[PDB]
Structures are given as structure tokens and as C-alpha cells.
Amino acid sequence: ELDQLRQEAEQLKNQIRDARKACADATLSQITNNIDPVGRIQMRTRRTLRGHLAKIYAMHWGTDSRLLVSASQDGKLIIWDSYTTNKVHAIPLRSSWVMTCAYAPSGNYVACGGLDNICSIYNLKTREGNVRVSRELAGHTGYLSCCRFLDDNQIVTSSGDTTCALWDIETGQQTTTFTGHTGDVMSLSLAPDTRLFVSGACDASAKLWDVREGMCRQTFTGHESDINAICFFPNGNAFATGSDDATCRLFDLRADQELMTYSHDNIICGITSVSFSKSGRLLLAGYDDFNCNVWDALKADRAGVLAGHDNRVSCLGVTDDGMAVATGSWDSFLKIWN
Amino acid sequence: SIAQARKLVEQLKMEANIDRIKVSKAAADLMAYCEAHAKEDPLLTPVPASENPFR
Amino acid sequence: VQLVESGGGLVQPGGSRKLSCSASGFAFSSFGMHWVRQAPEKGLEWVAYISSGSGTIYYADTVKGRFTISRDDPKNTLFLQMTSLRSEDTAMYYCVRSIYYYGSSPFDFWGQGTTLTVSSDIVMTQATSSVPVTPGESVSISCRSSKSLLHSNGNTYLYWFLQRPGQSPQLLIYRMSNLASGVPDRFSGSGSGTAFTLTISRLEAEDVGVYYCMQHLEYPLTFGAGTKLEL
Amino acid sequence: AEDKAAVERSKMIEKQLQKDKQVYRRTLRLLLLGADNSGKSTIVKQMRTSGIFETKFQVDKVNFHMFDVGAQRDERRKWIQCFNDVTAIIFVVDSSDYNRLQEALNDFDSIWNNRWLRTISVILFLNKQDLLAEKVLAGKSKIEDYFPEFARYTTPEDATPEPGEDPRVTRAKYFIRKEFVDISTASGDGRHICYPHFTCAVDTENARRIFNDCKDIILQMNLREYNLV
Amino acid sequence: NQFVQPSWRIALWSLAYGVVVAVAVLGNLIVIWIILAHKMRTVTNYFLVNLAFSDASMAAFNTLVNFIYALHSEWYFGANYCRFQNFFPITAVFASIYSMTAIAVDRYMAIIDPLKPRLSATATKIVIGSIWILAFLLAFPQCLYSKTKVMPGRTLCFVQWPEGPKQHFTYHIIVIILVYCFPLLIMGITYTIVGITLWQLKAKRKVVKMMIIVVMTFAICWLPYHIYFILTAIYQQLNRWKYIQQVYLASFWLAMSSTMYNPIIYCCLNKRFRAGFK
Amino acid sequence: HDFFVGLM
């Protein structure tokens, strides 16, 4: 009876595609053509945070827009003072193959995870004065690719076993499991309301999930290669992805389709990171060609280039207030731009 | 096999029933959000060096 | 967290003695340590300070060259060697935990105290020295400084301490606006650059004691006279 | 909370990072790769849901960190990028299983031509060579069924100065090597070099072979770093 | 005043020295720019850039000026300038030689024991400083005895040692021993071990060829240079035997040519340096 | 007098 179900699934996919085509009246470029452009954007390396031994795989800004945590593949987490380049903490990891790091919105916890399939939670605010592992979240059968805090007690972790999981930190158990993806899920982004989150997997598809419901609300299939990065538009009604086919794409939840592609014939390298400015007009993406690119989110033009890194730039993020942009790379250096 | 394919059509069934707005309205909303917060974007509109905490 | 300190007794006006503090329950090597003396029926006075790593060391002008502070990270023990012990060196010497990073709360834990009896600087002034009040009524302690404690970077280095009768000083408000951990929301601090106010919403039985003000803008760190609350 | 005290704490962190840098550069990291039929697990035991296994061993006062991968999915095109800038890749091949020896060739081809593994040398461990002779001395199974080019292959002039073994064993074991060196040569540049070896189940020279092979990988890294090439 | 040979000899020596100095500055500047700008910039390259700077300063400040001094021997400089060219150029020559020795030593360490840790970033700075200060200490005797003596008709000459020829002989004995014998012994003992070890394979043998070429050319170029000085120090009457000008010019050219051997081999051996130069 | 200097 598998053939009938496959035919019905194909019919449903055709219906969804027909609805998406019907909703498509005009492109985003057709609306933003008659608007003022952004112009050449020149950002300068205000700070350069050194100290990591091996390549930097991930970074995350604190909610105060001054503290940022970074993950290096030598088994080290460092919390920097971005204003003064000071080192606040240096947390050694049990496994040296960490691939993600998260800062709690309250600043009291930091999370990391890698090839060990375990999400370690570190308490930065301890009476003992040091930083200790408060909880290790085991239960994934694949490497951890991303993790983001919802609060001091809830966290969502992406994993290479094609599954995203919501965790309860005190109990250390998966209160919700998301099992829709086909390939390894490589990134996740939380909505501003923390009611939804998007995922990006190696199946060239992106899914919108409901945290409380636990079901896949929406699915986006614009890319043609593994999605390596994902980020939410500041208003929460759109999100941008970065994949290995050297293009960035803007999807909208309400439109249920793709609005623009941020690509160029010159760039032939995959996108490792993606981020939005405070207003959402600027789309910043990291590439394998050792430099980051600044994109006009509404006009799909190249506003500027961040070209100070000596190796693959793997992570990049904008502060909460939009003041600066921090980019990490495989050259073991973090650079802050303005 | 049949169980996995059975759940595929169930997930695809619910995704087709959601309300879908027009793309033009969504693009207009995105443009309006970009315009409304353009003044308070330190990257799109750089601040003077006195207000910049990185210079 | 614990800071048990030994050494004391009666010392002659020409003798010497060593004060030691045994740390336990926390990463001693990652913290800076202070010595604070409290003369009988008088206020607090900072003595010395050793940073994490036995690097930067500061002394008070009344003990500089006469006292010396030493650290022992492996044993989690901190020592204070006094060479000459004058008559005015009789007080209870407190040991204070201290850590310094962005957002940290120094002077957050104090030792139980050890007594020793012997047979320009910023002036922090507390206008009042005794304020009687009944429980449930809101009071407001005020303090002043010689110059502005508001630094250029944007934070005011004013610290609030409470010494309950028979108890060590306990941090309540650090940097003039931040509530210390483990203390109730009722306490709060205010001020602009030179006049600072500590106000408690609902006075309780455990809020009775002497309230001290400290500045950390630059060494030496100077305390206030002390404003006792009675009931 | 003086800012000068926060600078000293940061300076104290750098002192720990610099003394942790001495151990990182002095330690040689290795990645074990192989299938289930290969004796990869046996090689692990002969040195002295969790997604990674780490094995530490010393040869002549040199630290080696071997990283066996387990509890992962079948596809590896993403987590293999984590093993860039590594000293060597230990690839273990079951020579006896001629049916699955072809898929091992494709596994080696993908690793050798990987964009992020372009500068990493591979230490091939053709394991279970004792069972290879038994599968060719008996003559029940022959290579020519799977590889039509074995009939036209003859042993070169210098090969197998062993104390003693059957002539067809030598011709069989050097054809398996040949299929691997052609991949390492025709599908790769001179940046990284394959290091074929013949290993048994219980073999105590395996740690020495890795040490000698890693001494050569660093030697060419030093030659290019000092511009002596 | 003799040694004023006709322009035909002046043209020949001028052409011989001009190409030497031109290469010794141009290629050395190319090498230092490649190292310090195209980051390169590695701790292992600190010796290379230090040697490049030493060779550039040992060419520009020494070869051309002492060449124009050798022919038409009029010291067209002040008495203070004579003191300058007894301290800095000589320390540059000694620093270049000791930098060559240090490069040989660290190459030996990196080849014989690849798994052993390299020289510390701070240690490289301290050994570079030690080399420079040792060269300065060696050249200080030359500067402290930089008297000038004026003569009628011609320009004042630059005398070297007043305290007889016996003191001028032992100083040259020390300056030949610990500047030509011990450094060459070190870079022969280490380089022959490196060559035996390295004897893919084609590159590891062309490296050995470059090493033996470097050792042989160091042993050949610097021997007559010191022989001339020791002979003139031990033989007072030989310093004016109607022909010493040409002998000094030839020996000095042979010794000064070493300032361009290093940038040539650094481009011939490594492909990245060749591409950068081209 | 009439002699050649040298001067390293």
C-alpha cells in the first residue's frame, strides 16, 4: 500500500506548490525597485579578540551586547568583553570537538555541544566562583550542530541525527522531540516571541516548528544543497538561510515561499553563517572564501565586504542593539566591526 | 516503510490547509518594518564616534 | 563558601603576629582578597589587598611598610604579617572575598572575624549615625563623597554593607545600583555622582544594624562612619 | 570593581591559554576511519550514545590523540570538516573481504579528494593480512572476478622481502596496494602523501608504524614551512 | 698617490660591483617585503627576515662605499663617518654570518627532530638579540680605534690599529676563528647530517644540493677576505706593494657577493617566493 | 704615506 500513499503525497505536494504559485503576485524586487538604495558600506575592524588556539566554530552575543561567548575546536569556551577585549571566563570542555555555543538570555548559563552528542550546560554565576557543568543533556544519536536557550530552564538543540529536541534542564530530559527532517539538521533560529523556531538540514529544506505543540508547522524547499546557517528576521515573519550552493535565500512564514536569492556569479563558495542587522535591512553572511559579505536584504545588492579574515569565517553575529558585528573564523581570531 | 510513508501524507495534509497571504502584502510589511527601524540601525546609519562604544 | 580565620590574642605594643584565613568551598585562587579592620564601637577601615595571582598588592597608608600580605593558593590560605603593632592597631580584622570581571560583585562574602588586642583619600561621609524606626516603615540612608564616584566608563563605584549585631558585614548593593545575591528586593540604592541614597521598603527584624558605605573608584578604599538602625 | 583588576584577570587567563598552547602543539591528533568489517576496533585495543571515542598513547615520549568515531549517522560529509588541520588520517581496510574491498576504494577516493582534507596525509592500514593469505592459498575466491585488471597485473621487480610467503600471496597483496596508490596519485596533488602498510590482527608494530609515518608527515610540513622545497 | 688606475679599470670594477649591490638590495628588499607584508610572518621566518635585513644593511652601508674608497683612495667623508663604518657595517657582516649559522641550526632541529617543538617565539627574539649584540661587541674594537690621519695632496686615510701589528694580528685571529671556522663548522656538521637524513624524493635531494652549495660558497667566499686582512696585519710592507688594491678589490667583491646568494636560492628553491618575486 | 687602507 506504499504506492498509493506515495501518489497521495505527490498530489499533496503538487497542491502545496499550486497554492504557493497562486499566492505569488509580485516579487520583493518588484516592490523595492522604487526605493532608495543603501550605498557602499565600509565597516572597520574595531576590535580583534585573540587567544583561541584552534579554529573557532561558533560564537554568540549576550543580551547586554557587550559579552560574547566563543567556541573553539581545541576544547575551550571563552567569554569576551567586547568593549575592552578582556577575557571574562575560560571554560575547558570535556570534548574538544565542540561545534556550537549558546548564551542564555539572562547571562547566567552558557551551553555548548559537538561530536559527543551531549549538550553541556555551564553555570557562570556560582557561589564557588568558578564555572562548572550544571547539566549534560544526553539522548541524541548524532553530533550537535546548534543549540539556543529559551530561558534558564529550556533549551532547543539541533543534532546530526536528523532530530531537534526541546529539553528541560533540571530534569535533563527531552520534553519535546521534532522528527520531521531527513538529513542532518545544521542550524536553528528562535523567533523573537520564542513560540517558534526554524531549522536548516542537509536535505536542502527548512522547517518551521511549534515549541509547545511539537509539530512541523511549515516547510521551505528553496535551496539545492545543505543548509549551513539560518537566522530570523527581526519582526519574526521572515527568515534567511545560508547553504552550500553559494546562495542565500529569504523565506517568509506567511507567504510560505521564497522572496529573494542573494547570490553572485563571482562567489562559488558555500555560506557558513548568516545574520541580520537591527533594522533587518542588512544581511551579513560568512563564506568559505575567507571574507564576509554585506547584502541589501530588500535590493539583493552587495553593500560591502568584510575582508579581514585569513581563513574560513565560520560564525558571525550582530548585537542585540545592532551596534556591532562579531565574526569568527578558522584562523582562530574574532573580529568586531562597526 | 509503509508506516513512514503513511505519516508523510499526514504531515503534508496539514501543511496545505494553513492560511497563505499574498506575497505583495508580505513584501510591503517587510519594507515597512525596514523603513520604520532604519533610523535606529547603527550599521545601516553609522553613529558619530562619540556615541560609538567601539571607537 | 566559607572563610575561617585564625590568629589573635593579646600582643605587646612592640610585638608581631601573623593572621591567617582558611578558605573553603570556593575557588580561592580565582578571587582577590582584602583585609578589613573594625575598631571597637567604630566603623570599618580597609587594610590591604592581594589580587588573584599574588600580583597587584595594595596597602593602607597607616599600615604600609608595617604590614605585609601573603598568599598560598595550594592550601587556600591567606596570611597577613604585621611587623610593628601600635596601640591603635586593636580591632577585628575581617577577610573579604573579591572577584573582578565585567558584571562581577566584589566584596560579596566576608569572614567571621578575628580579634587582635594590643595593650588625597576620598572622604565618604554619612550624615546620620543613628536612625530609630519601627518595622514596616521605609527609611533612607544617605551618603556623600569628596569627588564624583561616577567614572568615565559609566559605572559609579559605591558599595553598601550591613553589619547585623554580632554578625560580619554583608554586601547589599554593589556599584550603587546592583542588588547583591541572597538579599531581598526591598533594599535599593540610588545617586547621581556624589550623593547616594540607600532605601529599604519594609523594615524588618533582620534589617537592624549599622549600614556602611564604601567606594572602589581608586585605592585606598574608604568606608563611612556608620549609620545604625534601631527599633 | 576597578577595570584595572579586570585587565589583570584577563592577563591571568592568557597565561593559562599559553601554557595550554604548549600541550596542543606538542600533541599529535589522529582520526581513525574504517568500516565495521575492518579491524578498526582491534587496532584501538592494541594501543596503550557517545558520539566520539578518544584513545591516548605514547611512542618515544610523543603524545598521540586518536579519535575513533562512533554513534554517528552513515553520512559524514559534515562532521568530517571538524577533522581539518589534523596530523594524519588512519584508514583501515579489510583486505580479505573482496566483495566490500571495492566500496573501501570509493571511501578512500572521497576522503582523499575532500576539499577540507586536501592537506592531510593518510596512513593506510590494510588489516587482516593473515586472513588474506588464507583466502588466496585456498583459491576458493579470486580477485579477478571483481577486478578484471588483475589478470594483466604482474608483481614489480622489488616487492615483499618477507622471511617467507607464497608467491601468489605477494601478487595479491600488492594489487590491493596498487588500487590505493593510483587513487592517492591520480586523484591528488603533492600536498599530502598516502602511507600504505600491511597489518595483522595481533600486531605490536602498529604503534611504531604510526610514529614513523607521522614523523614523515611533519617533516614535509617543516620543509614547506621553512621554504625548503 | 697610486691606485688611481685609468677609467678602464674603474669602469670594470664599477660594473662588477654595481650589479652586486643592485641585486643585494633589490632582491633582499623583495624578500623582506614578501615576509613582512604578504602574511610569511611566522616565528620560523624571524631568522630569515633578520638575515635579510642584515644582508641589506651589510650591502648598502659597506660594499659600495668601501668600493669607491678602494679605487681613487680618497676618503670623501668626515672623521665622524669613519667611526660609523667601523661599528655598524662590521656588526652587520657578523650578524649576517651568525644569522646564517642560526638558520642552519634551526633547520637541523626542524629536520632531524620534526616532532620536537620548535623554538619559542620569545626564544627566537632573545637569540636574535644575542646575535646582534655579539656582533656589536665584536665590532666595537674596530670603532673605538677609528683614528683618521691627514696627508698633503691626497685625502686623509683611515688607520685601524695604533698598538703595533701584534695586537692587530691577534684580533684578526679571533675574528677569523669565531666568524669563519666555528660558524662554518656548525653549518657543516648540521647540514651534512641533514643531507644524510634527506638523501617527493627529488625535492628532498635538491634541498641537500642547495645546502652543500651554500656551505661550499660560504667556505670559498670568506676565506681570501680574511686572508687579505691577516696578511696585511702580519706584513707591514705588503700593504703597499704596488698591487694590493686589485687584490683587495677582488677579495672584497668575492666576500660581498654573498649578500645576493641568499635571495637567489630562496627563490630558486621555494615556489611561493619565486612567484612573489615574479 | 703612500699605502692602501683596506677598512673591512
Side-chain angles (χ1 to χ4, degrees), chain A residues 50-55 57 66 73-74 76 78 84-90 94-99 115-118 129 138-143 160-162 182-184 186 202-203 226-228 244 288 290 312 330, chain D residues 3-4 6-11 13-14 16-25 29-31 49-54 65-86 115-116:
Chain A
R50 313 169 215 267
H52 274 315
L53 315 182
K55 58 172 107 97
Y57 230 73
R66 182 172 171 161
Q73 265 214 148
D74 75 276
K76 203 76 55 182
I78 296 181
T84 71
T85 72
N86 287 130
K87 283 119 164 154
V88 191
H89 289 115
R94 310 248 171 84
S95 149
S96 75
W97 302 114
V98 59
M99 305 160 48
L115 285 181
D116 51 11
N117 317 346
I118 301 168
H140 272 309
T141 43
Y143 60 89
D161 64 359
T162 70
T182 284
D184 329 44
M186 281 303 294
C202 292
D203 50 34
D226 324 305
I227 296 181
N228 317 314
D244 260 331
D288 300 303
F290 295 16
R312 183 202 211 173
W330 280 17
Chain D
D3 214 303
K4 288 86 208 153
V7 185
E8 147 180 11
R9 166 167 170 92
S10 175
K11 260 46 180 323
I13 286 168
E14 315 184 5
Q16 246 302 352
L17 286 155
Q18 292 299 320
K19 91 155 44 55
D20 281 337
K21 188 205 228 262
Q22 305 271 0
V23 190
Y24 186 82
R25 315 223 323 281
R29 291 154 293 278
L30 310 164
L31 174 65
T49 206
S50 195
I52 190 73
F53 299 142
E54 186 202 357
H65 279 199
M66 208 162 53
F67 300 108
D68 192 357
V69 152
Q72 302 286 307
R73 271 211 325 159
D74 40 306
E75 183 46 273
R76 65 149 95 95
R77 73 224 208 250
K78 308 307 284 188
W79 64 258
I80 206 66
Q81 301 162 348
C82 297
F83 292 105
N84 198 359
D85 72 0
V86 82
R115 182 244 188 297
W116 315 104

Side-chain angles (χ1 to χ4, degrees), chain A residues 291-312:
Chain A
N291 54 41
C292 328
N293 283 227
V294 173
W295 291 95
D296 203 348
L298 290 185
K299 315 266 277 141
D301 312 327
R302 192 120 54 110
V305 162
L306 273 41
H309 277 295
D310 190 15
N311 206 329
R312 183 202 211 173

Side-chain angles (χ1 to χ4, degrees), chain D residues 22 25-28 59-60 62 64 87 190 193 195 210-212 214-229, chain E residues 42 44-45 48 103 106-107 110-115 117 119-120 197-198 200 203-204 206-207 210-211 266 269-270 273:
Chain D
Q22 305 271 0
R25 315 223 323 281
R26 221 161 263 101
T27 305
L28 275 82
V59 184
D60 301 333
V62 169
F64 289 92
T87 305
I193 310 153
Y195 292 82
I210 297 166
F211 178 84
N212 289 351
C214 284
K215 218 168 83 52
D216 213 60
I217 295 154
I218 304 301
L219 195 141
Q220 330 267 333
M221 200 204 54
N222 289 339
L223 280 174
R224 294 175 334 240
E225 156 172 58
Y226 287 65
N227 323 276
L228 300 173
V229 72
Chain E
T42 301
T44 69
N45 278 358
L48 216 175
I103 291 188
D106 86 342
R107 278 164 178 179
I111 295 317
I112 287 327
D113 266 279
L115 297 182
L119 252 204
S120 327
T197 280
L198 307 172
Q200 177 262 355
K204 303 228 297 178
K206 146 183 153 253
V207 163
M210 176 286 264
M211 299 221 179
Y266 286 143
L269 255 285
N270 154 283
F273 275 31

Side-chain angles (χ1 to χ4, degrees), chain D residues 154-156 159 161 163-171:
Chain D
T154 36
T155 316
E165 65 180 30
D166 159 271
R168 319 113 74 181
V169 179
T170 291
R171 195 175 82 92

Side-chain angles (χ1 to χ4, degrees), chain A residues 5 8-12 14-33 35-39 41-126 129-212 214-338:
Chain A
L5 297 151
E8 203 187 8
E10 231 74 59
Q11 168 256 316
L12 282 165
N14 289 332
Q15 168 62 96
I16 284 142
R17 166 169 9 257
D18 281 29
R20 279 172 189 186
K21 206 279 161 292
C23 267
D25 35 21
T27 61
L28 171 59
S29 29
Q30 276 177 7
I31 304 193
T32 65
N33 252 319
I35 87 159
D36 316 291
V38 161
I41 284 195
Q42 315 114 324
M43 310 204 198
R44 200 137 289 92
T45 305
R46 297 291 201 242
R47 278 91 168 97
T48 295
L49 325 165
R50 313 169 215 267
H52 274 315
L53 315 182
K55 58 172 107 97
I56 293 164
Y57 230 73
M59 62 92 38
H60 202 232
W61 279 102
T63 29
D64 54 358
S65 285
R66 182 172 171 161
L67 293 174
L68 69 102
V69 68
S70 212
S72 154
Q73 265 214 148
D74 75 276
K76 203 76 55 182
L77 289 175
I78 296 181
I79 290 145
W80 312 83
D81 197 335
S82 95
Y83 284 15
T84 71
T85 72
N86 287 130
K87 283 119 164 154
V88 191
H89 289 115
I91 319 151
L93 310 179
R94 310 248 171 84
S95 149
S96 75
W97 302 114
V98 59
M99 305 160 48
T100 181
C101 74
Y103 220 129
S106 47
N108 314 318
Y109 302 102
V110 125
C112 76
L115 285 181
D116 51 11
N117 317 346
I118 301 168
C119 190
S120 268
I121 312 271
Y122 297 84
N123 185 26
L124 319 166
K125 317 257 168 108
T126 61
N130 45 27
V131 165
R132 43 146 199 101
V133 201
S134 84
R135 183 86 48 222
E136 289 178 45
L137 305 168
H140 272 309
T141 43
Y143 60 89
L144 285 172
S145 46
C146 202
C147 60
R148 286 295 175 258
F149 281 91
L150 270 84
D151 47 297
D152 278 340
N153 207 65
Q154 290 189 116
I155 203 180
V156 280
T157 60
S158 178
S159 164
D161 64 359
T162 70
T163 285
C164 305
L166 168 64
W167 299 79
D168 184 79
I169 296 178
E170 31 173 89
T171 58
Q173 255 76 236
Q174 311 196 8
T175 53
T176 312
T177 295
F178 309 90
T179 324
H181 269 309
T182 284
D184 329 44
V185 196
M186 281 303 294
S187 41
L188 71 105
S189 208
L190 286 172
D193 40 286
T194 52
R195 291 201 127 251
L196 306 172
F197 77 94
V198 286
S199 263
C202 292
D203 50 34
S205 92
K207 286 163 157 40
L208 174 68
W209 303 93
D210 210 298
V211 189
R212 255 82 155 271
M215 36 76 53
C216 177
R217 303 255 307 260
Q218 210 147 336
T219 304
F220 312 88
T221 33
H223 282 290
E224 55 219 51
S225 190
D226 324 305
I227 296 181
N228 317 314
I230 204 160
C231 190
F232 251 111
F233 195 79
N235 80 11
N237 299 315
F239 73 95
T241 54
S243 60
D244 260 331
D245 60 317
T247 81
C248 296
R249 287 173 160 85
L250 189 75
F251 302 93
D252 175 332
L253 312 190
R254 277 167 340 159
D256 205 285
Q257 59 215 255
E258 196 206 311
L259 308 150
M260 260 162 144
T261 309
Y262 304 96
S263 75
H264 210 268
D265 286 86
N266 159 7
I267 311 133
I268 64 180
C269 54
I271 286 98
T272 63
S273 31
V274 84
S275 211
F276 268 109
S277 86
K278 203 209 202 324
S279 174
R281 183 68 185 264
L282 256 48
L283 180 71
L284 288 95
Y287 291 77
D288 300 303
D289 69 349
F290 295 16
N291 54 41
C292 328
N293 283 227
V294 173
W295 291 95
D296 203 348
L298 290 185
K299 315 266 277 141
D301 312 327
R302 192 120 54 110
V305 162
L306 273 41
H309 277 295
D310 190 15
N311 206 329
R312 183 202 211 173
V313 32
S314 42
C315 30
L316 129 142
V318 183
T319 50
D320 229 43
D321 48 4
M323 215 54 87
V325 178
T327 77
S329 144
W330 280 17
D331 56 5
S332 78
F333 298 125
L334 270 142
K335 278 174 168 42
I336 297 177
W337 312 72
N338 225 303

